């Protein structure tokens with residue numbers, strides 16, 4: 288029921304980290 | 314007057330020279346065609362952060378500098394950046410007062426310090442020491458006169474005495490957790506004050522107007538006040554002079570020193586016009602003189618004019634008292650310190666507490682949500698709105714943009730990097746809601762449950778954008794279901810905004826506020 292929620296949240300995290308890594312430098 | 318492109322609205326406290334400023338305004342209008350309106354609203358320093366946080370308020374706000382750190386940390390003041398030729402026309406320590414984390418956030422106008430003001434006919438030579446004032450008062454009440462009356466209702470006026478023998482607000486790189494309002498020197502100064510009252514030398518009810526009438530009618534020999542007050546004394550014809558405050562336990566009275574400053578609202582659309590008015594109309598010899606004629610400013614920041622003013626003995630005394638005090642901190646906690654010391658003085662003076670109980674309230678209260686939420690909601694609203702238009706949804710109050718200055722740039726950057734994130738994950742997101750199976754009865758716990766699991770291992774600007782894209786998609790999905798209406802849209806927008814104010818505001822400020830956001834994700 289909610290362990291889906293855990294799956295969704297783990298994905299959103301990895302997604303966010305990818306964005307940060309693509310902008311570490313300017 | 315409302316904020317309006319092509320006009321200036323100015324807020325300034327009612328004890329300053331607002332009619333003289335208004336005349337500078339008129340001259341500006343004559344020479345340039347631009348209209349200037351000067352207002353002096355009640356409690357303007359508490360209103361500004363409420364209304365600026367929603368995009369309202371004046372173009373230019375005048376106040377002493379202690380209030381501005383709190384405003385800037387909330388994002389409400391625009392950074393100031395003058396030419397070297399202009400920065401050099403004003404004294405450097407006045408610029409230091411308005412520097413908050415390396416950024417200048419206002420224009421310094423005048424240095425303000427309390428001095429002892431006295432009636433040369435009834436006290437031809439003023440006391441040098443606080444302790445000798447009780448004897449002076451019985452000596453004057455013999456004659457139906459008083460020795461001293463000043464405002465006991467604002468802590469500004471009593472703080473020089475509380476600080477004299479060791480009182481301090483924050484230990485200096487300032488430690489929020491070491492305040493110093495309940496140390497021995499503080500207890501000693503407030504005890505002197507409260508003893509003067511209990512021994513019938515002052516009245517705990519006395520306030521600004523009562524003391525001014527007293528002194529300017531001739532009924533009390535001394536008062537404590539700033540240069541703004543000289544003007545009414547001159548009209549009274551009283552024979553006065555202006556000198557250094559008395560000492561307590563051999564040490565100087567240490568007034569908290571203020572720099573009257575003009576800050577520029579971060580929501581103003583007239584930032585550049587505001588700057589060139591201040592620099593070319595207010596901050597000249599003719600400009601400061603027009604204001605000074607109305608109410609004296611004190612020791613002005615403008616070198617060329619102060620060099621004349623300095624030859625006035627009253628300005629000399631102003632600067633002597635300023636060097637014995639401390640320039641106020643500008644940090645955000647200053648507000649809670651002043652509120653805490655307000656209550657403690659008022660209570661000890663009236664008699665409702667002992668000094669030891671009150672200054673120990675002041676100690677805890679000096680140390681450590683809704684206003685930040687309203688800040689964040691502007692950003693959250695611009696982004697949820699755009700995602701709504703993108704899906705073809707027409708939701709009341711989410712129609713049209715109409716964004717005001719700070720959020721324009723933020724909104725732009727946020728849409729750019731947000732599209733980055735989900736363009737790279739188009740499937741996961743399009744199916745996100747069919748996984749969760751939200752319902753009116755499971756919606757709030759699912760939103761929290763997922764949000765919490767994003768951040769359990771830590772935070773970064775990308776985990777925040779991921780979070781904002783989740784909540785935006787959550788919102789659009791709620792609008793889509795006939796059992797969860799337009800009502801769920803503003804409801805989820807609130808969930809998102811509160812979640813940020815509650816759980817993320819600390820990290821966001823630690824990493825620079827939205828100006829840091831702008832730099833982290835800046836282009837090319």
Ligand SMILES: OC[C@H]1O[C@H](O[C@H]2[C@H](O)[C@@H](O)[C@@H](O[C@H]3[C@H](O)[C@@H](O)[C@@H](O)O[C@@H]3CO)O[C@@H]2CO)[C@H](O)[C@@H](O)[C@@H]1O
Pocket residue numbers: 326328358359377378379380425467468469470539571648651652655
């Ligand atoms: O006590 C309640 C009050 O505390 C805080 O006000 C402080 C001001 O921030 C501070 O500048 C100083 O105010 C003086 C101005 O500098 C001076 O030019 C002149 O106008 O008188 C002022 C004092 O009356 O001291 C006060 C504290 O007394 C806080 O910011 C307020 O919101 C709050 O109402």
